[PDB]
């Protein structure tokens, strides 16, 4: 459902996070 | 790159409004 869509879209952001890193 | 990240991110929001109708 929709927190499982926002918890997907917090693991991209932490994946860019890395990656700008 | 930035702006296909982005893009890939409307992709993944226009499915979740699809979904969440
Ligand atoms: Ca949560
Ligand atoms: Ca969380
Ligand atoms: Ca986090
Ligand atoms: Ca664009």
Chains 1, 2 share one sequence.
Request: hydrophobic fraction near 30%; avoid cysteine; charge should be negative.
């Amino acid at each position: 459902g929709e927190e499982e869509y926002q918890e997907m879209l917090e693991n991209l952001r932490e994946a860019e996070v890395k990656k700008n890193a």
